[PDB]
Design a protein around this ligand. Structure first.
Ligand SMILES: NC(=O)c1ccc[n+]([C@@H]2O[C@H](COP(=O)([O-])OP(=O)(O)OC[C@H]3O[C@@H](n4cnc5c(N)ncnc54)[C@H](O)[C@@H]3O)[C@@H](O)[C@H]2O)c1
Ligand SMILES: NC(=O)c1ccc[n+]([C@@H]2O[C@H](COP(=O)([O-])OP(=O)(O)OC[C@H]3O[C@@H](n4cnc5c(N)ncnc54)[C@H](O)[C@@H]3O)[C@@H](O)[C@H]2O)c1
Ligand SMILES: NC(=O)c1ccc[n+]([C@@H]2O[C@H](COP(=O)([O-])OP(=O)(O)OC[C@H]3O[C@@H](n4cnc5c(N)ncnc54)[C@H](O)[C@@H]3O)[C@@H](O)[C@H]2O)c1
Ligand SMILES: NC(=O)c1ccc[n+]([C@@H]2O[C@H](COP(=O)([O-])OP(=O)(O)OC[C@H]3O[C@@H](n4cnc5c(N)ncnc54)[C@H](O)[C@@H]3O)[C@@H](O)[C@H]2O)c1
Ligand SMILES: Nc1ncnc2[nH]cnc12
Ligand SMILES: Nc1ncnc2[nH]cnc12
Ligand SMILES: [K+]
Ligand SMILES: [K+]
Ligand SMILES: [K+]
Ligand SMILES: [K+]
Lengths: 464, 462, 460, 461
């Protein structure tokens, strides 16, 4: 709305009214996040905050952005994946006068340029003092290329498992320069978003990309962590015959008890570098493989060579290197079906026969498939994650780490989670949004199990 | 040969029990793997274990594993209805002291525990405790403190017993260190959840043979037991509603596809009949308590339940349901053992054709063990492999022999290391024929783990 | 009263307590008591009955009696009787000959005690049968008794097949109602009943964890559908075998892998034809077909060690148990549970690992190792039985002239309106509320507001 | 220079062709027929008027009929169900097709008329393929002289079969028909499992709403209501089911659903007082599946929970009283086929009003309107049956029979069970399933031929 506003780059500004209509619907689906908006708007806890944000530019992220703004923050925003932006969301945010650099279908060069447009304002570093990140890419660029900016930054609030792992590695190596909150490991994040979000959105993305029947076909899910658990359910509930691979025997035990057969792409689970260690009989019967690990090369070249003709290959982990797509680019001919859907023809590199039967279907070029081929998690799930983000931003901004003397800084340089009481308060708003009614303990009951009537209700060791 | 140091229902059930133990051994690869692994080393040689836990076939395989590793034991059940009499017979016939039968009275329950503590009228030379619920642990602390001086530790099975240990620790009255066996993931997220998934609808079917599909259930609680219990009923086609005091657990119930409700209007339990959601409770065909808390199916709830509803409890203790109110006010008609019709027409007599009754299972005691056989061998494999590792560790640590200054540093309630949790899990996975993938060194490097594990930080929730 | 034989008459009070509970679970059947008690439509009926002597059958028996009938009763399986139900029925002065654990010889003796009273044929005039055994004995050994019987009401798929074979052969002597193919029987009992009771029986017999293990269900008709769901809902990885490609299509769409014990599905009699890799991974095999030898000797030899074998079809020849009696050593675990040692015939090692577990000696496992279907499901089947008994009794086929008998000799089903009326009482038992069409809506879809709501061709 | 078509955008043809080639690999029964019959050309001389959703799946059906010798002229049977890339691919292949996504009612009627007429005169049609009966109705009302030369109708769906049986009852049906709907590989495949796949699909594409944990009411529990109820329950919705048929209601209970009525005691007397307001005020999503009229009526729409989603997956939009909503409430388009209906009044709305419903596809079939309908591997079964039905009626040549023989053949019939089984077998092989072959002894034991059929015609599966 601001006169003359040009400080953005999006696909199509004319999508803004549609984006705004969907933001208004989403607000009604996000009671925890809108509750925080209503509760804290008057107090303006983020007045003076200048937030660099790097997370999938969806309608759900739009509601998050406008909550931070309504609480007083200024922001400059980019997406954390080349294919995850909803162009109507980016348009509505830019049309509101909020700097955003994001569109569906960026090149890698454009992706990096978008992050840098958040970091730079008018050719010079913005006076940022907060960071909100999803996967650690903006965190990495600041530390690597703009270290002096971190001298003014009070904290990082990191959304996802892969990003937390990168923060923990930096902390252990002494290279993290500001404190962080691990938003991923709130229960109303990890055990909501990572699991139930993928349950909703994995089969959604496969249907939108291929319109394949899933019932009666064979799937292999690589990984059975939170995303693998949700992904396996997304497919089993459609009637797929789902097999699960894992390296963690505890997660494998859960998959067995959950009714899945646990298998390995490699004979006896051992990859010895050769095609002979591939279980070709197993891979020759798989119609769909989904990677969920956060690890590297878990659907490798030899597996891709052995998959059943016309199998679908996709990744719902944060980064595309779960699958060896580089091998497929090097060796096989790609036929675009429509955006983010490619047939990969195993007959050769140069041409392909339009009627060749020996191809695989790759979704979102191996990038996060739920966001690449559909719209990621639904608003009512992202509500939990993004309520935690707002609370984490408020906490670190109020702590003012950048203003402490060097001695006090060493003491607070940590990666922490939000306290369980706040996790419970977020969950309560989510439950109320379904119309659920939580029972209140009597005093005698709360004494009996050793809790306060108001919570928290579990020790910090509890796993849910 | 000359063995009389036991008390069971019927020793002639021993051959039957032995046949079922031999089957159970083939369903318990983690526990039988520990037998093979440690039999030559005899890590429990010299251990003298007081054991108090449901005297089932699965507990029989645990006992014989401890004995095969060198231990001597004296055993009792931790519930009056949970013993399988053929299991107790097989154990006694093997020359092992066991005092347990299905259908004990409260007095007999206490006498059975005392027969493990005392031998020939004097304290046994016990030096280890294995407990399920804390009753043996409490009796030792209140009545036999001199015995605790020589006891190296307690390995506690279940959530309720852990809570009691932590209360003693907080108050400075815990006298020996403990391992919380419950919170291994191969226990809590296997036994507590999947075991109740298997055995709740099992006990309900054996007790009543009621169709469950199409009927309305209310599960009180959505912890590990409440999660498994709700799945037990939902997979049968029940329409399951869930009650909770923990909004995070309630959030999971919502996302898992259940409607979350309270027995009380707006969830406020002010003690009045007016606070009961009578419309809701009048539609419930089955209520199951799963909390470990007190009076979560209270008298006013019982008064308002739909005629002929089934009432049962799968938490550790019967006081989850106000059965005392029912004993005081209503007439009980035994249908068969552990199945009572409770007639709400009054306390003195009943009409055999009265329609206004509830069906109570196991007099409100743990229903999976009271009306069926508790969890299956292949699930208990996980819990009891952890039990054996925990016994080995505390016995080898020899707390009772440490100087006072060193005892002060080791008096705690700990869990097993994650590496051992994973090793138990791998044996369970192999039992299903599952094939775990091995990380390459670069993949292990990439995610920050050793190739052999552990694979997750200790904060990980699974 | 001494005209009965049961395991233990002192179980009568227990059985009566369970009958009173069952009545509250059987609203369609108890509704028939209330509504026809005044008319006494079965006054003068003398019913020979042959069906599993369960608590559920007890409520059926007492409904027939409440409507005016006399009966003489036996079980249709050696292991399906609940001894407390038989005791209660006997204690009520009703002739019944049935106990759990009959021998084959005793089974036949029991049916004969219903046929005979004081050493001569009873003056029976109605037949209620489950599986066709009593029907067959009457035609083969007591043909003159059929001259006085107005009809047969047959419960189950196997019995109906046998009825149709006789009709086709011109050897059926009295008309019959196929109770099996009411929708409130076939698509309730055969399917949902096995869903409730198959996992129930396996748990009672073995207490095995089912989650995470591999099952093979042979067949995917109504029993195979319900059986597959019984196992899948427990977390088994279920594979389905079928000869009918339409049923196999349903299994695929329902989320199962469809496999054959034989390579390429071709059962040529050789061990070479067995898919040994498949069978060596199966922890549980369940037959559901009503066919012969669908779990055959070569399959049994190839099965994974310690697999469970059971049958939930009507007859035990679905599994080649005779081969196992001939060749392998049987170790009873407890009643209706046997370890079958594949090490040889004469003796076994108590600790041998190479055995299979057979439930109920291959007889119907849900009734043999548990209690069969639950009351609220059997409500549907047995309401249809009562209505079919009333319908045939009132038509008095035995009294017709020879010419009117030829036209009257058939196998029929009950009309759809009655099927719907049974269903309505079942729905109300769940507290369900059925909506009533407006006149305009009924006109729009071409039905009466009263129904029937579907053409006779509709498959639900 | 081919111009005998009308589609949204012919330049979508290449994209449509890529998707047809994928769909062929997902449709083994239909492509099996294409390969089996191509040499014989059993439809040589057939001239088929076709009216059915112009999807990619219909494209494979069309090209199978053409490959077997037929000529066709095609339109969609719903204003929102066409996939424009499918229509473009068919037109670019030289096949007359008049269809686009988003037709008006007038355009819909014009498209059917463009198949019926060629160069302004009746086409020399001799076969009809219909989905819902609209083309069949127009021919009987307006083009009887064309029906004299038509050999048969093959009708896809429950609603259209009902319309055929009404005509047969009334003595107004002019040519015989095959009820394709009631093949088991159609009714118990397409109607049920197709809606299982595509109902939650269309709701997600229209709204992106979380379904887990929310309350749904499914009106009806026939084949479509069974599949729809499962579509929502498998996502974690809490599903309640309404029915007028107590046998279908019994199935719903046994399947684990609570059976409820929108009306107190089930009595629909037309009053607001009759609405169970407590029930409707808890419902987040209502789906109609009945083929009936006004089963989501104005008084239910008034009582629904704020922001509930309303949609219909039966053939026609009159299942929901959208006319009432047009007359009384303000419509706000969110995006194509998604409207907020503001219950605050007719004259405009507050952009931030909280009291609205979300209507999908303006009440038209939601799986096709907001997504792509059933998937190829499911439509394989329905469309293999269509091809077989077309061959059968075309070979019978009803239009050339004498009057006395027509009278003996004027009927609505289903395909024989042996064909139903052979279609199913190709579908099972497409999954890699392995069907067992009976031994001679087993075939004798159950009284069937080793090759089938395996069930009596009375069998319900
Ligand atoms: N697409 C989404 O919307 C979304 C949502 C949340 C998280 N994520 C991403 O998904 C990834 C996984 O997240 P998570 O929370 O489930 O983490 P997690 O640690 O809970 O689970 C990852 C699992 O992969 C297993 N694994 C690792 N290497 C393997 C291998 N070679 N073979 C088989 N299994 C292997 C591990 O044992 C572990 O259980 C991360 O990149 C995370 O950032 C994506
Ligand atoms: N029967 C069995 O085989 C078996 C197995 C394992 C554990 N247990 C016992 O079951 C009980 C629960 O164990 P757990 O591991 O699930 O514990 P938990 O802490 O994981 O779960 C208990 C749940 O009850 C809830 N709760 C407490 N008070 C409540 C109230 N008034 N209304 C509603 N919900 C309420 C809590 O919020 C919690 O989520 C303990 O007694 C434990 O020892 C029994
Ligand atoms: N135990 C119970 O409570 C119970 C209940 C109802 C019926 N039954 C009995 O169960 C049996 C099946 O009854 P139903 O109603 O399902 O009959 P059905 O005709 O519906 O199903 C039997 C199925 O077996 C399949 N089949 C036959 N031979 C096969 C083979 N060699 N391999 C694989 N599949 C094969 C057929 O194709 C058919 O689909 C009958 O004997 C019936 O009397 C038992
Ligand atoms: N969208 C799709 O892809 C698709 C697919 C197949 C069929 N259809 C259409 O869907 C509709 C239903 O087809 P079907 O095969 O399920 O029909 P069906 O006859 O099998 O089921 C319709 C059901 O609606 C019930 N019903 C009727 N009026 C009712 C009312 N007022 N309240 C509640 N229930 C009521 C009937 O009792 C019946 O069980 C038809 O119009 C058909 O053409 C749509
Ligand atoms: N819709 C969404 N918006 C933002 N981040 C997401 N991560 C997963 N789904 C998402
Ligand atoms: N079968 C079993 N044996 C011992 N303890 C148990 N707790 C639950 N089930 C049990
Ligand atoms: K979304
Ligand atoms: K057990
Ligand atoms: K029963
Ligand atoms: K489609």
């Amino acid at each position: 709305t601001p006169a003359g506003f040009t400080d953005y780059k999006v696909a199509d500004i004319t999508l803004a009214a549609w984006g705004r209509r969907e933001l208004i619907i989403a607000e009604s689906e996000m009671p925890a996040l809108m509750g925080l908006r209503r509760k804290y708007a008057g107090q303006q806890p983020l007045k003076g905050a200048k937030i660099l944000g790097c997370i999938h530019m969806t309608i759900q992220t739009g509601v998050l952005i406008e909550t931070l703004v309504a609480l007083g923050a200024e922001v400059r925003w980019s997406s954390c994946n080349i294919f995850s932006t909803q162009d109507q969301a980016a348009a509505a945010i830019a049309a509101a006068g909020i700097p955003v650099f994001a569109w569906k279908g960026e090149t890698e060069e454009e992706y990096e340029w978008c992050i840098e447009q958040t970091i730079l304002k008018d050719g010079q570093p913005w006076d940022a003092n907060m960071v909100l990140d999803d996967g650690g890419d903006l965190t990495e660029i600041l530390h690597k290329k703009y270290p002096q900016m971190l001298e003014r930054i009070h904290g990082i609030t990191e959304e996802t498992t892969t990003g937390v792992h990168r923060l923990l590695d930096m902390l252990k190596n002494g290279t993290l320069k500001v404190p962080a909150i691990n938003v991923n490991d709130s229960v109303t994040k990890s055990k909501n978003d990572n699991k139930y979000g993928c349950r909703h959105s994995l089969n959604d993305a496969i249907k939108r990309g291929t319109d394949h029947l899933l019932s009666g076909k064979q799937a292999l899910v690589i990984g059975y962590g939170d995303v693998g658990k949700g992904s396996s359910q997304s497919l089993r509930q459609e009637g797929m015959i789902v097999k699960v691979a894992e390296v963690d025997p505890i997660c494998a035990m859960q998959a067995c008890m959950d009714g899945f057969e646990v298998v390995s792409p490699y004979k006896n689970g051992i990859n010895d570098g050769t095609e002979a260690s591939i279980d070709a009989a197993l891979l020759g019967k798989i119609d769909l493989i989904v990677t969920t690990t956060g690890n590297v090369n878990v659907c490798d070249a030899n597996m891709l060579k052995a998959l059943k003709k016309r199998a679908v290959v996709c990744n719902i982990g944060h980064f595309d290197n779960e699958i060896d797509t580089a091998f497929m680019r090097k060796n096989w001919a790609w036929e675009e079906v429509k955006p983010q859907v490619h047939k990969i023809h195993r007959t050769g590199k140069d041409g392909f026969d339009a009627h060749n039967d020996d191809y695989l279907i790759l979704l979102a070029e191996g990038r996060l498939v739920n966001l690449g081929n559909a719209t990621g998690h639904p608003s009512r799930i992202m509500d939990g994650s993004f309520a935690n983000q707002v609370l984490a931003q408020i906490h670190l901004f109020e702590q003012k780490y950048a203003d402490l003397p060097a001695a006090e800084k060493a003491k607070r340089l940590s990666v922490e989670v939000l306290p369980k009481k706040l996790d419970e308060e977020v969950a309560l708003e989510m439950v109320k949004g379904f119309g659920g009614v939580v029972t209140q303990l009597t005093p005698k009951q709360a004494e009996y199990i050793g809790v306060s009537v108001e919570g928290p209700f579990k020790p910090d060791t509890y796993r849910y």
